[PDB]
Amino acid sequence: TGLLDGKRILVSGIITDSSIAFHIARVAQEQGAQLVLTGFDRLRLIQRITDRLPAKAPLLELDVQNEEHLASLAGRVTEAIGAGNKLDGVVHSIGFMPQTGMGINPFFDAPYADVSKGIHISAYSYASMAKALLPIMNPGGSIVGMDFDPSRAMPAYNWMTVAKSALESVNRFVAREAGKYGVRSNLVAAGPIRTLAMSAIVGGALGEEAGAQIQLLEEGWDQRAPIGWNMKDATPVAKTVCALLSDWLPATTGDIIYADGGAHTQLL
Amino acid sequence: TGLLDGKRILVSGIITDSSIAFHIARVAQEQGAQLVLTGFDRLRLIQRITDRLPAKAPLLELDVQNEEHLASLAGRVTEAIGAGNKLDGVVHSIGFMPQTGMGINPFFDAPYADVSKGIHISAYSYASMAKALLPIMNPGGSIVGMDFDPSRAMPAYNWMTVAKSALESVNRFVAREAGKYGVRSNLVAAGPIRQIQLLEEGWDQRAPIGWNMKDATPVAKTVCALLSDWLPATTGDIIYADGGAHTQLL
Amino acid sequence: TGLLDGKRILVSGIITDSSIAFHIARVAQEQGAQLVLTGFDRLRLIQRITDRLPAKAPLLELDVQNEEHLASLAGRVTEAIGAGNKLDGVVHSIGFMPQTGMGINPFFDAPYADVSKGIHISAYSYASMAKALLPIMNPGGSIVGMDFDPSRAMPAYNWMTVAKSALESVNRFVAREAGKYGVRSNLVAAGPIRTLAMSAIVGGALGEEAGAQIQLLEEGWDQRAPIGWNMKDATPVAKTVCALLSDWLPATTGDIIYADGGAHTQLL
Amino acid sequence: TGLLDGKRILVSGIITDSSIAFHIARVAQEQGAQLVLTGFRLRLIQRITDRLPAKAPLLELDVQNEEHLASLAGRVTEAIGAGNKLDGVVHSIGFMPQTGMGINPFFDAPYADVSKGIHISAYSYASMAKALLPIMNPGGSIVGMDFDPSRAMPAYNWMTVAKSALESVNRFVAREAGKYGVRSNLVAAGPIEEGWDQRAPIGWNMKDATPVAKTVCALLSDWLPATTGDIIYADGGAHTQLL
Ligand SMILES: NC(=O)c1ccc[n+]([C@@H]2O[C@H](COP(=O)([O-])OP(=O)(O)OC[C@H]3O[C@@H](n4cnc5c(N)ncnc54)[C@H](O)[C@@H]3O)[C@@H](O)[C@H]2O)c1
Ligand SMILES: NC(=O)c1ccc[n+]([C@@H]2O[C@H](COP(=O)([O-])OP(=O)(O)OC[C@H]3O[C@@H](n4cnc5c(N)ncnc54)[C@H](O)[C@@H]3O)[C@@H](O)[C@H]2O)c1
Ligand SMILES: NC(=O)c1ccc[n+]([C@@H]2O[C@H](COP(=O)([O-])OP(=O)(O)OC[C@H]3O[C@@H](n4cnc5c(N)ncnc54)[C@H](O)[C@@H]3O)[C@@H](O)[C@H]2O)c1
Ligand SMILES: NC(=O)c1ccc[n+]([C@@H]2O[C@H](COP(=O)([O-])OP(=O)(O)OC[C@H]3O[C@@H](n4cnc5c(N)ncnc54)[C@H](O)[C@@H]3O)[C@@H](O)[C@H]2O)c1
Ligand SMILES: Cc1cc(C)n(Cc2ccc(C(=O)NCc3ccc(F)cc3Cl)cc2)n1
Numbered sequence A, C: 001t002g003l004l005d006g007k008r009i010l011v012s013g014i015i016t017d018s019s020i021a022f023h024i025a026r027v028a029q030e031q032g033a034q035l036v037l038t039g040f041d042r043l044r045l046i047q048r049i050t051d052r053l054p055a056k057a058p059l060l061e062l063d064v065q066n067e068e069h070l071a072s073l074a075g076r077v078t079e080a081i082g083a084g085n086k087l088d089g090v091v092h093s094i095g096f097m098p099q100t101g102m103g104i105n106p107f108f109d110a111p112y113a114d115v116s117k118g119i120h121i122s123a124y125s126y127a128s129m130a131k132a133l134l135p136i137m138n139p140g141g142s143i144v145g146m147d148f149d150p151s152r153a154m155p156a157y158n159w160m161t162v163a164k165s166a167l168e169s170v171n172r173f174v175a176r177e178a179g180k181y182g183v184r185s186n187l188v189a190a191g192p193i194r195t196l197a198m199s200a201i202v203g204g205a206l207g208e209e210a211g212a213q214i215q216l217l218e219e220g221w222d223q224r225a226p227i228g229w230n231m232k233d234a235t236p237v238a239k240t241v242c243a244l245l246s247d248w249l250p251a252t253t254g255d256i257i258y259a260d261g262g263a264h265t266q267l268l
Numbered sequence B: 001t002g003l004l005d006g007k008r009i010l011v012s013g014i015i016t017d018s019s020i021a022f023h024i025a026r027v028a029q030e031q032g033a034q035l036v037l038t039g040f041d042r043l044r045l046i047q048r049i050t051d052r053l054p055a056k057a058p059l060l061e062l063d064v065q066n067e068e069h070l071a072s073l074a075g076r077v078t079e080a081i082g083a084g085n086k087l088d089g090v091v092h093s094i095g096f097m098p099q100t101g102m103g104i105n106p107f108f109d110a111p112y113a114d115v116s117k118g119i120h121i122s123a124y125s126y127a128s129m130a131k132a133l134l135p136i137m138n139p140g141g142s143i144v145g146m147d148f149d150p151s152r153a154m155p156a157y158n159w160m161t162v163a164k165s166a167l168e169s170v171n172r173f174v175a176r177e178a179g180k181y182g183v184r185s186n187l188v189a190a191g192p193i194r195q196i197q198l199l200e201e202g203w204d205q206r207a208p209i210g211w212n213m214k215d216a217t218p219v220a221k222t223v224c225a226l227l228s229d230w231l232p233a234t235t236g237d238i239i240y241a242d243g244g245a246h247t248q249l250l
Numbered sequence D: 001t002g003l004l005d006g007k008r009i010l011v012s013g014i015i016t017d018s019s020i021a022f023h024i025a026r027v028a029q030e031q032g033a034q035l036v037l038t039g040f041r042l043r044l045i046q047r048i049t050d051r052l053p054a055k056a057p058l059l060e061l062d063v064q065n066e067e068h069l070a071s072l073a074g075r076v077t078e079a080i081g082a083g084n085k086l087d088g089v090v091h092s093i094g095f096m097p098q099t100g101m102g103i104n105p106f107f108d109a110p111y112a113d114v115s116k117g118i119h120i121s122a123y124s125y126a127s128m129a130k131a132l133l134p135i136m137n138p139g140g141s142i143v144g145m146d147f148d149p150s151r152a153m154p155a156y157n158w159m160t161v162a163k164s165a166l167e168s169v170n171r172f173v174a175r176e177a178g179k180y181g182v183r184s185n186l187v188a189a190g191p192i193e194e195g196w197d198q199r200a201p202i203g204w205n206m207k208d209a210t211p212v213a214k215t216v217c218a219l220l221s222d223w224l225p226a227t228t229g230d231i232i233y234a235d236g237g238a239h240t241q242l243l
C-alpha cells in the first residue's frame, strides 16, 4: 500500500535529475502517486529528464512570472487529470536569485530589479500557485513548498535568504486561505543539496574560493547534523515532502518541517 | 501494507482509553507495529485498558523516578521482545505536575519540591529513557516525546509550561546522543486535548484547519509519522500537531 | 548630560505629528541629539510639521525608490552637518503597502507590482539607506529600523507582514556590512500605533469591518501585554529607539528589540 | 546626570571582581544608582564588594533557603530606609554541579544534581521576584542573566536545560510583575567559544564584561519602558549569524 496511493499531485521545478523536484516526483511515483509536471522555459529538455522517472506524467509549461500561464493553469491541469478530477497535492519546488543577489556579489550591490525578480519567483509565486490551483484541490489536500532556513543571516545566500524569509511569511497566509478548502500548506526546510546552481559554484562559476566555501558549508552541516547530512542525496528531503503530501500530517499547516539532519537544532 | 509494518515500538503513558498514548498505540498497531507497553502503578487496571487495544502487547512496569526500573528496562524489553531483536521506536507520553504548579494555584505559590517532581517526570525522564533504550534500538529508529508549545506563557499551565521548555531543551541533547545510533529524537507539540476554556477554545479559532479538542487521532498519526521512515532527516526538532494555531496570531 | 548628547542622527519617516518618526525625533532632540531629517514628496507640508519639534533641524528630500536621491544623500547630509563630521545615528522609519496588499483586500488579490513596491519601500530601502549612509557614519554608530512582528500571520496586515519578514532578514545582513564600520544595526518591533493609515482604517476608510478588526487587534495586544499597550502613545517606542541609538546597547546588532508591552511573549 | 540616577537596585551574584554581577554593580553605581548587595561565605564576598566605587549593604541570601527569602524584603527595607522601595533587581546567580555541566556526559547527570542546578538557576528567579515585588516601585525592572539555550551545544549540557527553564520562568514572572507596573527581562550574554568573535558582526571580547553590564543597566533604566517577558542579546550579534 503506497503512501500516496491514488493521489493526484502537481510537481513543479524539475530542471535536471539532481533537482529536488525530480526526487520528490520519483519517490511520490514509487508511493503510487499519479503526477502532473510543470516546467520552465526548456520544455523539450525537461521532458527528456522527466522520461527517466519511473512513470509517465503530463508535462505543462508554467512560468510563474507569466500571468497568462497562471490564468490557464487549472484548466490545463484538469484536462490532464480528466474532468471531474481534482489535485490532492501540490509541490512548489521553484526558486531563483540572480548572481547579484546570491553568491559572491556584495549584499549592498544587488539592484532591486534583480532582487524583486528573485522574490517574485521564489516567494510571491507560492501564493500565485496556491491561488490558481486551490479551486481544483480536494479537501484533505496538501500544498508543499521548499525552504532554506533564513532565521539567521549567512554568507553567499544573501537576498535568497531574504526571499526565503518572505516565503515563510507567505506560507502562513496561504495556510489561512487553503484552510477554507480543507487544504494544508507547509514548507520543508532542506539542508544544502547539489543542484545545478550549486554544482556550478563548486565547479568554479563564481571563482576558486567560492567553490571551496560551499564545500566547507556542506561539511559543517554534516558535523552539526546529529544524524549527518549528505548533500548529494535529495531522497531524504523528498520523503519529508511525500510525508506532508500524505494523510499522516493531518493537523500541521502554515508550518515548517526541517529536513536538514537536525543541523538547525545544534549550535556546534 | 502499513506505515509501521514490522516495527517494534515501546509506548509509555497509557492510563485511560482517552490518553493520547492510547491512540498512538492503537494507530501504531493498526499500521502494523508490534508494541511493548509501560505502566506506572495500577498495572492491573492498565492491563484491562490495554486489552481494549486492537492487539495484545507485553506490559512492563516502569516508574521513571525509580533508578532500578531504568537499569533493568532494556533487559526487560529485550526478554519481552525476544533476544536478537531491537526496538525501532520509543514513545514518551509521560507528563506530570502537582496542582500546586499547574492550574488555578498562583505561579509564585508552587513549592520547589512539587516543581522538581514535575520536571523529573516530564522532562528529565526523557533523557532517562533514551539513555536506557538507545543501546537496543535499530538504526533508522525514532524517539518521540509529547510537547505543548511553551514559547509563550499562558494562564494555568504555569510550571508545566516551564517543564515543557526544559523538555524541548532536553530533546536537542538526546538528539546529540542518539545520532551515533542513527536514531532520531523529536517532540510532537499537540494542541489541547480533552479562563483555561477560553485559552483552549482560541485554538480552533486560530487554526486555519480548525482544532477539535476531543479528537486525539490527528496527533496520534503525527507521532506514527515520526516513528516511520518518512521523516528521516529530522531530529532534535518539534513537529506541531495543533491545526496550525501556533502560526497564527488571530 | 542627555542620553544622545552631541550625537548627529538621521531621522527619516516624518509625515504627521503622529508619525513614530516624529516622536523618535522629539525624544532624540530632548536628549541632546542634533538631527537631520528626511521627508518624502510633500516637503513644505512636512517642514510645517517638523517645525513643531523642540529644535530646528535641516530637512532633506528622500524618496527611497529614487536612485538619484540615494546617490546624493550622503553628500547632502555632509553639507548639512559640515565637512569633517559624520553621523552617529540613522533612524529608518519608512514603511508603505498599497491597499491591495494591506487592509481588507483578499491576500490572493494583491498584484505583484503592488507587493514589490511595498517590499521596495519597507524592506529593501533599509539596505539602500545603510549603503548610502555607512560611508559617512562614525565608529560606535547605530542604525535603527521599525519592525512589526511577522513571526505569525495576522488579519489585515497581509503583505506588509511579508515585507516585515523580509525586513527582519535584511537587518541581519545589514549588520554584517555595518560591522566593518563599527556600526550596529537593529530593528524595533513596535506594537500597533495610531499613525496616519491606521487612523484612516479605524475611521472607516475601507469600511466598518476593517476598522473593527484593527481595534480588535489593538485590544488583544493591550490585554496580552503584561504591562499593557496604548496604541495612541508612541513615546515608549521612541525611547526604545533612542536607547538603541545610545551607547547603552553596545553588544547588540542584527537583532530585534520588542517594544510591544510584552504581548509577543504571551498567549492571551 | 546619570542613567540610573536616584534609583535603588538589588544586585545579586557577586563572588569575584571578574563575575559579571560585579561589573553590573560598578556601572550602576557610576550611573547614580544606590545598591543593595546579596551573597551566598559572606566574608570573602565582602572583600570583593569593597572594590566597588561605593559602599553598599551586603545581605545574606541563599535562594535555596526559604527563611532568607521570607526575611529578604524586610532586610532590604531596613538597609534602604522605610518609605523607600527598590527600582531594580538583578539576578546574576546560576549554578550547576560538574555532573550536569562540563566534561561529564549528558546522560550521567543524576537528577538530584540537575534539580539543584535548576532550583538555583531557574526557579530562584521566581523566588526572588515573589519576595521582592511587593517592595518594588512601578516602572521598576527585574533583570536576569541568560545564555542562549535555543540550540544544543557541547559541555553546557544541563545548564542549557536550566536556561531554557529560566526563559519560560521569565515570561510568567513578567505576567506577575505587570500588576506592579514592573518589567521582567533576561540578558543573554556571550561567553565571558572563540568562534563567537567571528560570528559577531561587531566582534566579541570574552575578557570585557562591560558591554553586557551596560545592557543590564539599560533594562534597569526607563529607556526600555515597553519591553517585558523578553530576552535582550548582548553577544555581539553572534546569535543572529550562521558562520
Ligand atoms: N539546492 C539546495 O541546497 C536547496 C536547499 C534548500 C531549499 N532549496 C529550494 O528547493 C527548490 C528547488 O531548488 P533546487 O535546489 O532543486 O534548484 P533547481 O534549479 O533544480 O530548481 C529550481 C527550479 O525553479 C525553476 N524556475 C526558475 N524560474 C522560474 C519561473 N519563472 N517559473 C517557473 N519555474 C521557474 C527552475 O526551472 C528550476 O526548475 C527551490 O525553492 C530552492 O530554493 C534548495
Ligand atoms: N494535556 C494536554 O492538553 C497535553 C497536550 C499535548 C501534549 N501533552 C503531553 O502528552 C503527554 C501525555 O498526555 P495525556 O493527555 O495522555 O496525559 P495522561 O495523564 O493521560 O498521560 C500522562 C502519563 O504520565 C504517566 N506518569 C506520571 N508519572 C509517572 C511516573 N512517575 N512513571 C511513569 N509514568 C508516569 C501517567 O501514567 C500517564 O499515563 C504528557 O507528557 C503531556 O504533557 C498534554
Ligand atoms: N503604526 C504601526 O502600528 C506600526 C507598528 C510597528 C512598526 N511600524 C513601522 O514604523 C514605520 C513608520 O510607521 P508609521 O506608523 O509612523 O507610519 P507613517 O505613515 O507615519 O510613516 C511612514 C512614512 O514612510 C514614508 N514613505 C512612504 N514611501 C516612501 C518612499 N518612497 N521614500 C521615503 N519615504 C517614504 C511616508 O512619507 C511616511 O512618512 C514603518 O516602517 C511602519 O511599518 C508601524
Ligand atoms: N559566565 C558566562 O560566560 C555566562 C554567560 C551568560 C550568562 N551567564 C549567567 O550569568 C550568571 C552569573 O554568571 P557568572 O559568570 O558571573 O558566574 P559566577 O560563577 O561568577 O556567579 C554565579 C553566582 O551564583 C551564585 N550562587 C550559587 N548558588 C547560590 C545560592 N544557593 N544562592 C544564592 N546564590 C548562589 C554564586 O554565589 C555566584 O555568585 C549565571 O547565572 C550564568 O548562568 C554566564
Ligand atoms: C537556497 C537555494 C539554493 C539553490 C540552488 N536555490 C535555487 C536556485 C536555483 C538557481 C539559482 C541560480 O541559478 N542563481 C544564479 C546563479 C547561477 C550560477 C551560479 F554559479 C550561481 C548563481 Cl547565484 C539560484 C538559486 N535556492
Ligand SMILES: Cc1cc(C)n(Cc2ccc(C(=O)NCc3ccc(F)cc3Cl)cc2)n1
Pocket: C095, C096, C097, C098, C099, C100, C102, C103, C148, C157, C160, C195, C196, C197, C198, C200, C201, C205, C206
Ligand atoms: C505595520 C504598519 C503600520 C503602519 C501604519 N505601517 C506603515 C504604513 C504607512 C502607510 C500605509 C498606507 O498608507 N497604506 C495604504 C493604505 C492607505 C489608506 C488605508 F486606509 C489603508 C491602506 Cl493599507 C501602510 C503602512 N506599517
